[PDB]
């Protein structure tokens, strides 16, 4: 099971690019597909979304008109079509399934990522960054703009690696993650704890509402050696 | 004029591409399952990707699903790795290397090809140490879990393959007998007894115990 994004490279401004998600392993036309991004300033942004027969579209406020979004599903590919890329399109950009899991949502399968380069409610985390070492316990504070009960997912994102769902509904952990990850929280601030960190461990943490639509992530916590 | 030969390498841009080549002689291609491995200055080695005998079967670590494919053309005993929207930490020698069978162990490797761009755990003491000719050299390895003698230790000079010198803990690879090799379950120790001049490199070991292969971030024994 996984996703394969392709098509990113060096475009100049107002350029075009086609990326392309094949997804294997799984009924692709079963679930609903997004792509997500992340600048050099990073931070997980929601681009786009699209239902699972492919009839009903939504994008973020900065590429309407001028990237589309669509799906083949006799082929498990879901599309970007993306024109007129400006400076600020320069991300990692993320295909990912979003999965009703028990009574949730959450993004819980993603792609490793492809790279587009373009030359010639909100979510508080805290801290922003912090330094540890192995066997430390690990405190992450997410604070919601607004009440959104216990919809609250958490993605861990190693670096250069895609990011991976550790909790979802506030405080389930996802399957394979191991026991000393903990969330807990409801209403406006939450909490990701690591009780003894491990090697694998150092990596960007992000929570992420999943209350109200557009989905919106934290700026995330970047957790370093020393 | 049994070997492997690496090629492709080069730097680029993060979020390019490149195509590495392993080309075989000497001995048949087809019959083995063929393995790519990197090494970065912080993370001594680590096993990439690995494909069946058929080339219908690939495995993957996970920083490269879904970014590296490996296949092969067994009809021009080379083997390939296409690697995709490449990363700063992909920077790494990349060599390619053969698996071999009673134990398991990686008993061929190329001299490796540079690209620069711009779960078992083995733990290996001393990281870097420095001797004389004649000194005894005691190197350390642990395993996060009992292996019991499922594991091995290779020898690698400055551009040159890699090379098997113990198998199954304490087996010698047909390598001088100041070399040895002991223990079983967690703690194993490599021992020179007598460092010889050709003796000075970087040396692995590695479990052969559960996939995927792992190794520790290497012991560089060097000159004073």
């Known amino acids: 099971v996984q996703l394969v994004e392709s098509g990113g490279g060096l475009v100049q401004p107002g350029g075009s690019l086609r990326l392309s998600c094949a997804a294997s392993?799984?009924?692709?036309?079963?679930?609903?597909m997004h792509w997500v991004r992340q600048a050099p300033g990073k931070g997980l942004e929601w681009v786009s979304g699209?239902?699972?027969?492919?009839?009903?579209?939504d994008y973020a406020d900065s590429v309407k008109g001028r990237f589309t979004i669509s799906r083949d599903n006799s082929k498990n590919t879901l599309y970007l079509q993306m024109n007129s890329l400006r400076a600020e399109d320069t991300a990692v950009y993320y295909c990912?399934?979003?999965?009703?899991?028990?009574?949730?949502?959450?993004?819980?399968?993603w792609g490793q990522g492809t790279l587009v380069t373009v030359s010639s409610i909100q979510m508080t985390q805290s801290p922003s960054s912090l330094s540890a070492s192995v066997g430390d316990r690990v405190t992450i504070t997410c604070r919601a703009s607004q009440d959104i009960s216990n919809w609250l997912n958490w993605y861990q994102q190693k670096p250069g690696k895609a990011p991976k769902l550790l909790i979802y509904?506030?405080?389930r952990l996802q399957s394979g993650v191991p026991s000393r990850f903990s969330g807990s929280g409801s209403g406006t601030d939450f909490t990701l704890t690591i009780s003894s960190l491990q090697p694998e461990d150092f990596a960007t943490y992000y929570c992420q509402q999943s209350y109200s639509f557009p989905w919106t992530f934290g700026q995330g916590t970047k957790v370093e050696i020393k | 004029?049994?070997?492997?030969?690496?090629?492709?390498?080069?730097?680029?841009?993060?979020?390019?591409?490149?195509?590495?080549?392993?080309?075989?002689?000497?001995?048949?291609?087809?019959?083995?399952?063929?393995?790519?491995?990197?090494?970065?200055?912080?993370?001594?080695?680590?096993?990439?990707?690995?494909?069946?005998?058929?080339?219908?079967?690939?495995?993957?670590?996970?920083?490269?699903?879904?970014?590296?494919?490996?296949?092969?053309?067994?009809?021009?005993?080379?083997?390939?790795?296409?690697?995709?929207?490449?990363?700063?930490?992909?920077?790494?020698?990349?060599?390619?290397?053969?698996?071999?069978?009673?134990?398991?162990?990686?008993?061929?490797?190329?001299?490796?090809?540079?690209?620069?761009?711009?779960?078992?755990?083995?733990?290996?003491?001393?990281?870097?140490?420095?001797?004389?000719?004649?000194?005894?050299?005691?190197?350390?390895?642990?395993?996060?879990?009992?292996?019991?003698?499922?594991?091995?230790?290779?020898?690698?000079?400055?551009?040159?393959?890699?090379?098997?010198?113990?198998?199954?803990?304490?087996?010698?690879?047909?390598?001088?007998?100041?070399?040895?090799?002991?223990?079983?379950?967690?703690?194993?120790?490599?021992?020179?007894?007598?460092?010889?001049?050709?003796?000075?490199?970087?040396?692995?070991?590695?479990?052969?115990?559960?996939?995927?292969?792992?190794?520790?971030?290497?012991?560089?024994?060097?000159?004073?």
């Open positions: 990912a399934k979003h999965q009703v899991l028990e009574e949730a949502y959450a993004f819980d399968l």
């Open positions: 509904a506030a405080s």
């Open positions: 699209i239902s699972s027969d492919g009839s009903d579209t």
């Open positions: 392993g799984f009924t692709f036309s079963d679930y609903e």
